[PDB]
Swiss-Prot record:
Post-translational modification: Dephosphorylated by PTPRC/CD45.
Purpose of the protein: Non-receptor tyrosine-protein kinase that plays an essential role in the selection and maturation of developing T-cells in the thymus and in the function of mature T-cells. Plays a key role in T-cell antigen receptor (TCR)-linked signal transduction pathways. Constitutively associated with the cytoplasmic portions of the CD4 and CD8 surface receptors.
Cellular-component GO terms for this entry: cell-cell junction; cytoplasm; cytosol; extracellular exosome; immunological synapse; membrane raft; pericentriolar material; plasma membrane
Protein name per its UniProtKB record: Tyrosine-protein kinase Lck
GO molecular function: ATP binding; ATPase binding; CD4 receptor binding; CD8 receptor binding; identical protein binding; non-membrane spanning protein tyrosine kinase activity; phosphatidylinositol 3-kinase binding; phospholipase activator activity
Section of the entire sequence shown: 123 to 226 of 509
Amino acid sequence: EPEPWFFKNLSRKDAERQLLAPGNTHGSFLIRESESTAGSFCLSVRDFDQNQGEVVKHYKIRNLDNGGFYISPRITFPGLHELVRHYTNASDGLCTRLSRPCQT
Ligand SMILES: CC(=O)N[C@@H](Cc1ccc(P(=O)(O)O)c(P(=O)(O)O)c1)C(=O)N[C@H]1CCCCc2cc(OCC3CCCCC3)c(C(N)=O)cc21
């Protein structure tokens, strides 16, 4: 299964609720298609926050001109796969590392 993280047709709300569901943890994520707008993707990741503990945050995956992707204009990956790779290896400015893909 090439992309267990690509929960493409999930709504913001369905993404959060899903991540904060059993079988998931810190760095547990998914890349759903953008809700508020369209055409771009979004990376939803569960994370630890001292106050209310487990939460979910969303990172906008802006589309590169040539078709690539990138959350930060510093590193601009060729595909959603290398994006998930680079951020799984290290947060690199993210609130947390992309440990493992969302489960259900
Ligand atoms: C309201 C919201 O969830 N905002 C998100 C970004 C986001 C997500 C989803 C959606 P959508 O509804 O379409 O699904 C939208 P929108 O409505 O506006 O279109 C926006 C966000 O602001 N998250 C923080 C989360 C962590 C706190 C700080 C932060 C930093 C960010 O970028 C900075 C650099 C840091 C170094 C690594 C690369 C990113 C981003 C970000 N989108 O890049 C988001 C957030």
